[PDB]
Paper text:
To reveal the molecular basis for the [name]-[name] interaction, we first solved the crystal structure of [name](224-559) in complex with a constitutively GDP-bound mutant [name]([name]; 1-176) at 1.73 Å using molecular replacement. The overall [name]-[name] complex adopts a compact and globular structure. The interaction between [name] and [name] resulted in a 1∶1 stoichiometric complex and buried 41% (4031 Å2/9845 Å2) of the [name]. In the structure, [name] is held in a large and pronounced groove made by the four “fingers” with an extensive, though not complete, charge and surface complementarities. Contacts between [name] and [name] are established through a combination of hydrogen bonds and hydrophobic interactions involving the switch I, switch II and the interswitch region of [name]. [name] (residues 224-559) is composed of seven α-helices and ten β-strands, which arrange into a structure resembling a hand with the baby finger buried in the palm and the remaining four straightened. Unexpectedly, the structures showed that GDP-[name]([name]), a “constitutively” inactive mutant, adopted an active conformation when bound by [name]. Surprisingly, structural comparison revealed that the conformation of [name]-bound [name]([name]) is essentially identical with that of [name]-bound GTP-[name], indicating that [name]([name]) is in the active conformation following [name] binding. As with GTP, [name] binding induces striking structural remodeling around the switch I region of [name]([name]), which swings from the edge of β-sheet to the nucleotide-binding site, with the largest displacement of 9.2 Å at the Cα atom of Ile. Despite loss of the γ phosphate group-mediated interactions, the switch I region in [name]([name]) is stabilized through its interaction with α7 of [name].
Residue numbers in the entry:
A (entry chain A): -2 to 176
B (entry chain B): 225 to 566
The structure:
């Protein structure tokens, strides 16, 4: 609550981010690696949304992030449109080992156009980049696609942490630019 | 953050207790829920109408792209159907329609309604035969077996549509409660007090608890619309959610591999070979894929992906996840508490 001897941390910005993309691509693992620095190989289905909090320092400012993971099965997705309310940035995730998840990126972009604010920021993430022998989605194809939309693109691994912090830092930098 | 781990204990505790409380209250919900008020009906109709307009605008923005436009039209048709169902309730609240039971006699509550009819319709019942027809037109059909059959079909269609409407009404009511929770959660997240931040997480648990009720209704709706079917523990078809362990598409099968059910298309099967598993079309086998590492890898990958689409009912899934999450947490705690001692 705050005394002179134990003060709660303040923040200069509070951004709401949503993770979307096919079930199984690693949205929850990205969330947990970034927010808690944990990882498990064991899959657990979602029955609804989740959020985590993490505060970062960027450009001399303190940014609190509330990061929401969306649900997977249609029966658990009734009020998806409500989670976009107040969202500053959407991170669209595919799985570099799964061509279908990449092809579906266009459907996820449609959901953003349908539900998000007009000024929302976007980032494309190709996850599971540690699975080198199982990769099927070509970097240059994905980079060209992101470039055609004017959005940033990173390949990540929630398992090894590759580019996980960078992804969120990049999204926060893009949002801050328009504040 | 060790303390985050230590806290997860009660956190998981609170989460699964909340989930189980909502699952147990489901049956009572069906009978005791509060009806939507007109204001609630209007709020949902406004929201769906705005969504409809947005989809229309996106279709224009994507003109020419048959595939994208078709996708947008599927969504738009879905929203149009929800709006028409809400319009029935609105009509009932304004007297343009009235609720009747199976004999065509008026009832007060949507709960007790079999059909909602307008002033130009009537219901005729005789010893378990049910007819819906234009008001005053019995003589036109009474000696015409084909026309009586049409009237019986019309009764059944209207009855089926109102059943859809009743489930959707409960969904909308719960949805509005959940949307209010999200505002309070945002207020709590704004706080720098970690105690308020923790309260937001507790409120999320109640939010997802209501989502479990939505999920059961969505499964009931899917089965009602003949998109999906319920199955018991042995994979035998059943009619009621109460007897179901699984729910899957009409185009799918419960495929038994190693004593576990995998939901795959009827035209697919799974092959086991020396510890590897391949999702294949019915006409393929080891002989047909042995010459193609590409086919093998894709089929293995496609089998691996099946875990992301469970066929379990909501209640069974929640129990399954509880076990898994608890086990992972206990493992982490055990390692933290003990490993350093050696
Ligand atoms: N090798 C590897 N596996 C991952 C990675 N991220 C996720 N996974 C695995 O892929 C599965 C699906 O991840 P999950 O976060 O639950 O997917 P979600 O449905 O998008 O939330 C999980 O069981 C993970 O164990 C990664 O970066 N590398």
């Amino acid at each position: 609550l705050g005394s002179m001897s134990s003060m709660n941390p303040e923040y200069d910005y509070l951004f709401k981010l949503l993770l979307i993309g096919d079930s199984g691509v690693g949205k929850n693992c990205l969330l947990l690696r970034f927010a808690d620095d944990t990882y498990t190989e064991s899959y657990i289905s979602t029955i609804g949304v989740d959020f985590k909090i993490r505060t970062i320092e960027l450009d001399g400012k303190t940014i609190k992030l509330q990061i929401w993971d969306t649900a997977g099965q249609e029966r658990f997705r009734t009020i998806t449109s409500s989670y976009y309310r107040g969202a500053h940035g959407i991170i669209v995730v595919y799985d570099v080992t799964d061509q279908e998840s990449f092809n579906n990126v266009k459907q996820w972009l449609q959901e953003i156009d349908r539900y998000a604010s007009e000024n929302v920021n976007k980032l494309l993430v190709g996850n599971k980049c540690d699975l080198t022998t199982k990769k099927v989605v070509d970097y240059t194809t994905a980079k060209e696609f992101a470039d055609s939309l004017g959005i940033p693109f990173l390949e990540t691994s929630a398992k090894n942490a590759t580019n996980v912090e960078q992804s969120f830092m990049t999204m926060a930098a893009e949002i801050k630019k328009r504040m | 953050k060790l303390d985050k781990l230590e806290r997860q204990g009660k956190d998981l505790e609170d989460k699964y207790k909340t989930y189980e409380e909502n699952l147990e209250g489901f049956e009572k919900l069906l009978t005791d829920s509060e009806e939507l008020s007109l204001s609630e009906i209007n709020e949902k109709m406004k929201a769906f109408s705005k969504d409809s307009e947005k989809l229309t605008q996106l279709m224009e923005k994507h003109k020419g792209d048959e595939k994208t436009v078709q996708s947008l039209q599927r969504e738009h048709h879905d929203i149009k159907a929800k709006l028409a169902n809400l319009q029935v309730l609105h009509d009932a609240h304004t007297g343009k329609k009235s609720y009747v039971n199976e004999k065509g006699n008026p009832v007060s509550s949507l709960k007790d309604a079999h059909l909602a009819i307008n002033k130009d319709q009537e219901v005729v019942e005789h010893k378990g035969q049910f007819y819906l027809l234009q008001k005053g037109q019995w003589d036109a059909i009474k000696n015409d077996p084909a026309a009586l059959e049409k009237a019986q079909k019309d009764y059944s269609q209207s009855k089926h549509d109102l059943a859809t409407i009743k489930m959707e009404a409960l969904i909308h009511k719960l949805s509005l409660e959940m949307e209010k929770q999200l505002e309070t959660i945002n207020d709590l997240i704004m706080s720098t007090d970690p105690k308020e931040n923790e309260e937001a997480t507790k409120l999320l648990h109640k939010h997802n608890g209501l989502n479990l009720k939505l999920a059961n209704l969505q499964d009931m709706l899917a089965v009602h619309r003949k998109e999906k079917s319920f199955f018991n523990e042995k994979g035998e078809k059943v009619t009621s959610l109460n007897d179901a362990h699984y729910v899957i598409g009409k185009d799918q099968q419960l495929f038994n591999l190693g004593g576990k059910f995998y939901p795959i298309h009827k035209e697919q099967k799974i092959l086991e070979k020396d510890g590897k598993f391949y999702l294949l079309k019915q006409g393929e086998d080891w002989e047909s894929i042995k010459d193609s590492p590409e086919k093998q890898k894709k089929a293995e990958h496609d089998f691996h992906k099946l875990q992301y689409e469970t066929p379990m009912t909501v209640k069974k899934l929640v129990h399954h996840n509880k076990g898994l999450e608890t086990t992972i947490h206990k493992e982490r705690i055990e390692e933290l508490e003990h490993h350093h001692h050696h």
